Amino acid sequence: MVLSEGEWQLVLHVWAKVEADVAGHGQDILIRLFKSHPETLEKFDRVKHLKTEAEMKASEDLKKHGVTVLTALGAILKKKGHHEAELKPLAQSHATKHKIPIKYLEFISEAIIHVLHSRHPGNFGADAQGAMNKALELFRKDIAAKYKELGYQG
């Protein structure tokens, strides 16, 4: 797939608002993920044990994870499709070490869209949501292909 410049602009315009508060958005997104799809929490040996949303909010380790995920995703989106170098190490750890099925990347994509929609309604109308979904589909498609080369296509 290929986004147009206009679609990239919509994506990077709402992302610039996310970056005003990386840790807060990280928290919202992962908590939304873990509430919606509790199986995903099992992948994090560090936060596995957390039982409630209050515990999740209070967790410093969860908030670090969120910042790590969003910073890596931000660097990828800012490449505007030319992200082959950033993807390689990421596809290798998630295929071989963490073992994150593509289905889980779909779930977090849903969580990202949900949280942007709540927090940024004026900058996240239909066309901006369409452009973000396209960017995240592109990301999942390129990851899935690398998974296959690495022997996982999990």
Q: Of the two residues 45 and 122, which places its CB atom closer to ligand HEM in the complex?
A: 45
With CA atoms as reference, report the closest residue to 143 among 98, 97, 92.
92
Q: State the maximum Cα–Cα separation within the chain, in Å, rounded to a whole number.
A: 43
**Beta-strand runs (E) in 5-154:** none
- Tokens of residue 41, six digits: 């929490």
Chain residues 74-93 in contact with ligand HEM, contact rule CB under 6 A: 90, 93
**Given candidates 9, 19, 21, 46, which one binds ligand HEM under the rule CB under 6 A?**
46
Task: Name the minimum Å distance from CB 125 to ligand HEM.
Answer: 22
Does 31 participate in binding ligand HEM (rule CB under 6 A)? no
Residues whose CB is less than 8 angstroms from the CB of residue 74 and which lie 6 or more positions away in sequence, other chains included: 15, 18, 19, 22
Task: Name the minimum Å distance from CB 84 to ligand HEM.
Answer: 15
Q: Determine the distance from the C-alpha atom of residue 86 to the mean position of all C-alpha atoms in its chain, rounded to a whole number.
A: 14
- Asked if residue 49 belongs to a known ligand binding site, the reply is no
Site residue total, ligand HEM (CB under 6 A): 17
**Given candidates 22, 105, 113, 144, which one binds ligand HEM under the rule CB under 6 A?**
105
Please measure the distance between the N-terminal and C-terminal CA atoms of the chain and give it in whole angstroms.
Answer: 21
Chain residues 106-145 in contact with ligand HEM, contact rule CB under 6 A: 108
**Given candidates 35, 57, 88, 98, which one binds ligand HEM under the rule CB under 6 A?**
98
Q: Of the two residues 23 and 72, which places its CB atom closer to ligand HEM in the complex?
A: 72
Does 27 participate in binding ligand HEM (rule CB under 6 A)? no
**Cα separation, 61 vs 46, whole angstroms:** 7
With CA atoms as reference, report the closest residue to 10 among 80, 87, 106.
80
**Given candidates 100, 131, 132, 135, which one binds ligand HEM under the rule CB under 6 A?**
100
- Tokens of residue 54, six digits: 């209050």
